[PDB]
């Protein structure tokens, strides 16, 4: 009979002995168990294969090797294209084997085996079991020896060898050969450069995916809905928290007005408009502490709150003018991900702490149907949102319909379980955020009323806020401007910091909560607008536009007209499910989370990532343990009961820079740490 | 520089024009848009490729083709091994293309291009986009034309052609050439053969995975735990159901005693011991109807219940003696899966109906914390059980530890949420099955008490039970003895039917519920003991043993000593989660469920299954729709409110055999229907 033969030829990059440790490991393993055939008098490929196989330990073994042109897998050197007939590498995958076997056979006289194998002198046989790590497969071990034999000079030295000991020494010798401020001086330069780099590209922001081809109108609509739910609901939670911390001085109306006005201005007038401004729990702590200070002394809350905001904006303006944002470049992947993971944990803790408050208040009566339903709604919202989030990686629908359905994972989950909780369970009371009609009519806060000995206190608090604002604004912007997120417009670090000061000084004067870059929202905003090739997963490009951020801000502002509806129809557990959803989905692409899971994973399932190929496995696990230790340091000072140590948390963020660049190099080699950053 | 070239050679089976429709479809598509180059005077591969590519619509196109030995992908014919230098097929995957392009070029004079391409006359170029169905990829379309060109006689006819019209006609002509009772006579033979086929292998059943190598002791322990929870909890539910249907005549104690005694005897003395005996809801309907009959007339329940059991066993004995189980061979995959899916739906409906009863009784007070918690516990048990079930397909643990953890998916989920419901929510009442001390002390039922005009009624009911027992016992045993489940011991259909009659006549005499083969449990029992290669998914072998079934039966019997504990500690929602778990997990490997999902799936995600390659896609979807229509027929007569039409449900099972073998061939071709069965 006749059979069809499929021949596939693919180029393979030469193994990099300088970077890839696996080449050294494979060579050392071969040298420890050397199987070298010297002066092989066999004149045929079959006899050479028989000799090598019997040296390993017979007819069945050769049957697996074949299907020289009959060999199933081979690697040959090509010179830019001329083949290298001097040597040949043979590769086979045998299930019955338990470990990798490598044999090198040298022929006495060159043999003519084919068109590209007419001068064969060295035959390399590599045998490996099918279930192996992607870095130590049969092909990978072959690439180690193929790279060494691809050098004409090295092959000549092997031919000159006379004994097996000299043959190994040549292999060792070849492996050795293969192995072997002024920036801040111009004040205001950063601000001018950022504007100059973004102003010409300003019209492109509004017409990036509206005119021409590749009209991503569906992406813009879905992203705006995602931002609207991801911003408004936490804003209500933080507005209610400020309502009960300031005794009505800052209510839900002011927290949503500040988000709308601040978000609208930032979207229009900032470079890199993918950064989403939102108030945070640490910012609520500062507002709460100011109320305590204003209660202990005879100070007006609005006057003191305005002044510390003014000093906060004053210091932020100096940082942008002095180009201080350049120091934030020291926060590499080794440090940003620890802070990135910590904030996600805080959102998880907010849902957990909120659920415990429902159990304490309702279940124990400090009735039970509300507590149990709250657990069901919170977990149900997380399940439905995450299931729709993963639906984009399924074949069950048309790609256009599936993309839209998965992009609305959060809006659907919030809407679906709001109806379930408010209409499917009308008979069960649900915990809902407090709402009261407007009380403070957006006053000026009377900054002149506050006297000396108090503006100095605001200056002290303003300096602490400046460090919190400076670090958080640049860290989230760095995540947005990450090299993996292929942005081809610019960064605009210094202009954003100055604009954030301009935004926050207005909010402080009118008693509105401060807002800066939000961690979970902005990377997700970039991720929502990104196109994933899924080749492992890479972002082809991101639809950089102001429409999503500007549209969401307008929608948040319009929520004031119908403000009673979200608070009465959306219960707290739906928000707590949203907190779990954004925290979990923000962990995608986090290398620290990937390496934590790497510990609880079989060896054969290790992906061929960049750091695994370069860094030793033991060093990788040591680095993961040290990062977890640094994470617990953040948790101790960031999620504690005492409010004073939580306020000095930005100092802990600074303290990890000496830890990364001084303490860590003494434990792990500096080159290995660089691979993690790269 | 030097680069490494990887050459992979793999044999490809010749495309089967008789069976695979895709060969005909590809050839017709090529003929509709023929791109044929006649009398190609080019003397080089590059010029021929340029001519073919310009005929398709230039330098960039060729760069993708190469990396003749430089071609990335090629298919050549090999004669048993001598290559065929006459022709050559070139394959390339281009992203910029929207549809498949095939070009055939005939050379005026043979050209010498390489060692195995020294007499090239025909060059075949196939171009396809990367995202295509597995049956119509670039390689698959190449295999269609490579198979035709692999015939020496066909190539000669092409050489004799003079015009393009004659060239196409030769392709059409080649495609046409490629395209072109006594059993029941020995009474008792089946019973003797089954015993003779299983008795010599009886000692192997107890020592299959205990002595020697491949000691699957861990599998036996985990499977026994799975069977114990999967049998005892439904038994309690059906015992409680019989308790409230017979007014205490058949209680939980009798339903568990019958399961233990019947299961223990079946495990020891039956061939194919992987079949699990369990009472079913249809069997509870017969018990309930007998109570109604015994209430309408002045008949003793135990006397009438015993007699209809005696007649049921009498008819089942005749079926085994007359070798009637051979007729059940007409139930192929087209019919078994419809019944298989229906039973899984009934278990889903039992959980849904039970949950509605909790809402009606507790939520509406016919309080609310019990109803809401019941929903949370039922869904939580399903989630935890299914998550652990899918954990076996993860790399996050050692294979031995991961296998044990995933095999205990059901025992852990039941135990975990029993503690959560009974200890984490002690303050909330939960619906639990009724328990009362033993009332009937296992009497003889006094069969002689029942007089004529009533034993005739039992004979009528016994005949209906016999049809229910006959069909269900053979259907579940057929699923256990499925060809995919590679069992190398035997089937034993006739002996099991006789033994089931012997088991059920004892149960009827002592007032115990009838038990026959259980659908969800026995395939899962085989699946639990099976080894999956996961090459898509195939079962290498199954650990056929009696220890799992016998051990579970003993454990069920020992549950009588501590009988109050399961009923008071395990609430109904945990059972309802178990019903959802077994119903969902039993759908794995169901081709009907796979084809239902095939409708809601993009074309490019269609797997290369057996039926997809042979049967036209439109015919596959027509067959799926017809099977769903048959499924709704079962639902109408099997899940209705009226009990009389539910009792004639086995007649509907019989009625689908004429539908499959008479009605369906008039709608879809008989050959296509055979592919589904095969
Ligand atoms: C939470 C915080 C984290 C705390 C982390 C604490 C430090 C963990 C130290 C891990 C550690 O050192 O263990 C590692 C591996 O880890 C595991 O198998 C298991 C690693 C996880 C253990 C449990 C962690 C806690 C849960 C032992 O690695 P090793 O130092 O023994 O090195 C092997 C070497 O012995 C092998 O011979 C070599 O393979 P061959 O090719 O056959 O020579 C290996 O090469 P590859 O890397 O190319 O495969 C090397 O990686
Ligand atoms: C629940 C119960 C089920 C009710 C089922 C009712 C019958 C459904 C009839 C489906 C039906 O006939 O639609 C089919 C496909 O289906 C869909 O795309 C979509 C099929 C699903 C539609 C929605 C079903 C309900 C949800 C139309 O198939 P078709 O008859 O147009 O045939 C195509 C043919 O037109 C194409 O030219 C050919 O591809 P080329 O290679 O480019 O020539 C195709 O070849 P392959 O099969 O090798 O790819 C053929 O399969």
Spatial strand order of the main sheet of chain A: 2-6-7-5-3-4
Structural class, from helix and strand content of chain A?
Answer: alpha+beta
Percent helix of chain A: 55-70%
- State Rg of chain A: 32 Å
Distance between the termini of chain A: 55 Å
GO cellular component, one term (chains A, B): basolateral plasma membrane
GO molecular function, one term (chains A, B): proton channel activity
Subunit structure (chains A, B): Homodimer.
Catalytic activity (chains A, B): tetrahydroxoborate(in) + 2 Na(+)(in) = tetrahydroxoborate(out) + 2 Na(+)(out)
Give the helix/strand layout:
The structure is a homodimer of 678-residue chains.
Chain A lengths: L1 E11 L8 H12 L3 E5 L4 H12 L2 H7 L7 E7 L2 E2 L3 E7 L7 E11 L8 E9 L9 H12 L2 H9 L3 H16 L9 H10 L3 H5 L10 H29 L6 H18 L7 E2 L2 H16 L4 H21 L11 H31 L4 H23 L8 H9 L1 H16 L30 H26 L12 H17 L6 E2 L3 H9 E3 L6 E4 L4 H12 L5 H6 L2 H14 L5 H9 L10 H5 L2 H22 L4 H5 L1 H19 L2 H8 L1
Parallel strand pairs in A: 2-6, 5-7
Antiparallel strand pairs in A: 3-4, 3-5, 6-7, 8-9, 10-11
Bound molecules: ligand PT5 (2 copies).
The site of one ligand PT5 has 14 residues of chain B, from helix 1 and helix 25.
PDB class: membrane protein
Keywords: SLC4A11, BTR1, SLC transporter, membrane protein
Assembly: dimeric
